[PDB]
Design an enzyme around this catalytic site. Structure first.
Site, PDB file in Angstrom:
ATOM      1  N   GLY A  40       0.799  -1.371   0.138  1.00 42.59           N
ATOM      2  CA  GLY A  40       0.009   0.067  -0.015  1.00 42.59           C
ATOM      3  C   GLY A  40       0.706   1.367  -0.032  1.00 42.59           C
ATOM      4  O   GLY A  40       2.187   1.323   0.086  1.00 42.59           O
ATOM      5  N   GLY A  42       0.257   6.047   0.615  1.00 41.69           N
ATOM      6  CA  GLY A  42      -0.544   6.988   0.872  1.00 41.69           C
ATOM      7  C   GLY A  42       0.250   8.400   0.773  1.00 41.69           C
ATOM      8  O   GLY A  42       1.534   7.887   0.501  1.00 41.69           O
ATOM      9  N   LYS A  43      -0.197   9.430   0.873  1.00 41.90           N
ATOM     10  CA  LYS A  43       0.733  10.471   0.832  1.00 41.90           C
ATOM     11  C   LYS A  43       1.645  10.713   1.924  1.00 41.90           C
ATOM     12  O   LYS A  43       2.521  11.798   1.896  1.00 41.90           O
ATOM     13  CB  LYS A  43      -0.153  11.931   0.820  1.00 41.90           C
ATOM     14  CG  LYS A  43      -1.284  12.162   1.829  1.00 41.90           C
ATOM     15  CD  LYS A  43      -1.987  13.421   1.295  1.00 41.90           C
ATOM     16  CE  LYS A  43      -3.361  13.492   2.119  1.00 41.90           C
ATOM     17  NZ  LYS A  43      -4.164  12.120   1.735  1.00 41.90           N
ATOM     18  N   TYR A  44       1.582  10.005   3.098  1.00 42.05           N
ATOM     19  CA  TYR A  44       2.442  10.287   3.939  1.00 42.05           C
ATOM     20  C   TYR A  44       3.070   8.739   4.201  1.00 42.05           C
ATOM     21  O   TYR A  44       4.249   8.903   5.277  1.00 42.05           O
ATOM     22  CB  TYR A  44       1.629  10.307   5.340  1.00 42.05           C
ATOM     23  CG  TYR A  44       0.593  11.493   5.295  1.00 42.05           C
ATOM     24  CD1 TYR A  44       1.303  12.913   5.236  1.00 42.05           C
ATOM     25  CD2 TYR A  44      -0.604  11.490   5.516  1.00 42.05           C
ATOM     26  CE1 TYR A  44       0.479  13.859   4.880  1.00 42.05           C
ATOM     27  CE2 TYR A  44      -1.671  12.943   4.830  1.00 42.05           C
ATOM     28  CZ  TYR A  44      -1.013  13.770   5.068  1.00 42.05           C
ATOM     29  OH  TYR A  44      -1.661  14.976   4.919  1.00 42.05           O
ATOM     30  N   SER A  45       2.986   7.775   3.751  1.00 44.37           N
ATOM     31  CA  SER A  45       3.884   6.575   3.783  1.00 44.37           C
ATOM     32  C   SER A  45       3.587   5.642   2.890  1.00 44.37           C
ATOM     33  O   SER A  45       2.738   5.668   1.821  1.00 44.37           O
ATOM     34  CB  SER A  45       3.362   5.661   5.095  1.00 44.37           C
ATOM     35  OG  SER A  45       2.113   5.365   4.831  1.00 44.37           O
ATOM     36  N   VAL A  47       3.723   1.418   2.482  1.00 47.86           N
ATOM     37  CA  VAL A  47       3.429   0.093   3.202  1.00 47.86           C
ATOM     38  C   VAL A  47       3.841  -1.147   2.515  1.00 47.86           C
ATOM     39  O   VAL A  47       3.737  -1.406   1.454  1.00 47.86           O
ATOM     40  CB  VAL A  47       2.110  -0.120   3.794  1.00 47.86           C
ATOM     41  CG1 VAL A  47       2.087  -0.948   4.815  1.00 47.86           C
ATOM     42  CG2 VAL A  47       1.775   1.447   4.553  1.00 47.86           C
ATOM     43  N   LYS A  62       5.655   0.097   7.768  1.00 46.81           N
ATOM     44  CA  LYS A  62       5.182   1.268   7.185  1.00 46.81           C
ATOM     45  C   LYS A  62       6.356   2.235   7.216  1.00 46.81           C
ATOM     46  O   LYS A  62       6.794   2.714   8.398  1.00 46.81           O
ATOM     47  CB  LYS A  62       4.019   1.852   8.185  1.00 46.81           C
ATOM     48  CG  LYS A  62       3.651   3.219   7.865  1.00 46.81           C
ATOM     49  CD  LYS A  62       2.350   3.776   9.047  1.00 46.81           C
ATOM     50  CE  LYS A  62       1.903   4.934   8.495  1.00 46.81           C
ATOM     51  NZ  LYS A  62       0.804   5.376   9.571  1.00 46.81           N
ATOM     52  N   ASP A 150      -9.893   9.790  11.045  1.00 48.14           N
ATOM     53  CA  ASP A 150      -9.578   9.382   9.330  1.00 48.14           C
ATOM     54  C   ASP A 150     -10.299   8.156   8.923  1.00 48.14           C
ATOM     55  O   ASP A 150      -9.825   7.314   8.367  1.00 48.14           O
ATOM     56  CB  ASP A 150      -8.320   9.530   8.980  1.00 48.14           C
ATOM     57  CG  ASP A 150      -7.904   9.340   7.409  1.00 48.14           C
ATOM     58  OD1 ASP A 150      -8.858   9.692   6.791  1.00 48.14           O
ATOM     59  OD2 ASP A 150      -6.740   9.099   7.150  1.00 48.14           O
TER      60      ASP A 150
END
Ligand SMILES: O=C(O)Cc1c2ccccc2n2c1[nH]c(=O)c1ccccc12
Length: 325
Positions: A40, A42-45, A47, A62, A150
């Site tokens: 996976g 996201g804009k912050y990590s 995974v 992560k 979230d």
């Protein structure tokens, strides 16, 4: 405004519990965990599924993208405080790359099927079962003085085979303190509560209940996202076209909020659209009177009016899930 439940959790606990900035990370060994495959992003990590080279068991790695020390300590402290709770992901270790100091959070392994492929196969009972499981996680974190901020399908990992659920990504979570004015730039657009969309800053745990409501509505009506706005202004418009503007005005006046004239113009005036009008041949098998009643008690403009996670769990809609469990 203040939470109707768990308002004094952080008031009664030691400052060390919620003072995440005072935390000094005890870094483990980066070599202990090796990346096997990406699962996976996201804009912050980013995974990955990984492996603990010592015991050879699976884990989730992560790797965090560059961000402020304050925010990384916030996520770590919250994860440590919630570790062991019902359906909350389990933080096992915290490591960093010696050269660039890129931090990685190590978690117990959790398999998952993207909701886009999983949800269409969920039966009437499956939905009741999984939402109940998610509620356990929310009542738990709220009872521990934490708002997730979230909640969305992307942050609800489900291993359908094992029928196991985990609430993940606590990177936006925060401790609840009565009267504190929080940043409204949280959660993901389609799941943002009216409070965030009208800049009401002293919000609370109830924010997660609106997001849960959006998720639930998307599931029973087979319409994801349920409220599909393009930008934050449009998001409120879409909500208004469903719940109606009359209830919005009651809400705005109660909390003495003045909408930006531009936003007020976009919202306009709309009558309330009954939940039953969202039923069609594609979702008829999932829209029951109990599901609708439960949804109705979640999607309320007024955050103080929404069901708490604890109340939600007792709703008759989940009666078989409780009887079984
Ligand atoms: O805690 C987090 O921020 C992320 C997290 C996370 C935290 C703990 C366990 C699994 C986790 N996963 C993820 N993110 C994923 O995208 C993902 C995709 C497939 C399977 C598992 C995923």
């Amino acid at each position: 405004s203040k939470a109707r439940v768990y308002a004094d959790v952080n008031v009664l606990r030691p400052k060390e519990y919620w003072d995440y900035e005072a935390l000094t990370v005890q870094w483990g060994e980066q070599d202990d965990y090796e990346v096997v495959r990406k699962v996976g992003r996201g804009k912050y990590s980013e995974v990955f599924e990984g492996i603990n080279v010592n015991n050879n068991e699976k884990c989730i790695i992560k790797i965090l993208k560059p961000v402020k020390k304050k925010k990384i300590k916030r996520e770590i402290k919250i994860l440590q405080n919630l570790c062991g709770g019902p359906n909350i992901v389990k933080l096992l270790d915290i490591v960093r790359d010696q050269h660039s100091k890129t931090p990685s959070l190590i978690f117990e392994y959790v398999n998952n099927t993207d909701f886009k492929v999983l949800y269409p196969t969920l039966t009437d009972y499956d939905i009741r079962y999984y939402i109940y499981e998610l509620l356990k996680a929310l009542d738990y974190c709220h009872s521990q003085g934490i708002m997730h901020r979230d909640v969305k399908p992307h942050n609800v990992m489900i291993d359908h085979e094992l029928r196991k659920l985990r609430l993940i990504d606590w990177g936006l979570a925060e401790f609840y303190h009565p009267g504190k004015e929080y940043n409204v730039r949280v959660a993901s657009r389609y799941f943002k509560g009216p409070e965030l969309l009208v800049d009401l800053q002293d919000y609370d745990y109830s924010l997660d209940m609106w997001s849960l409501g959006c998720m639930f509505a998307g599931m029973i009506f087979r319409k994801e996202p349920f409220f599909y706005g393009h930008d934050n202004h449009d998001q409120l418009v879409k909500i208004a076209k469903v719940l109606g503007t009359d209830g919005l005005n009651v809400y705005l006046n109660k909390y003495r909020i003045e909408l930006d004239p531009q936003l007020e113009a976009l919202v306009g005036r709309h009558s309330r659209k009954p939940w039953l009008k969202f039923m069609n041949a594609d979702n008829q098998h999932l829209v029951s009177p109990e599901a609708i009643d439960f949804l109705d008690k979640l999607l309320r403009y007024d955050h103080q009016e929404r069901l708490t996670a604890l109340e939600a769990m007792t709703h008759p809609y989940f009666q078989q899930v409780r009887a079984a469990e």
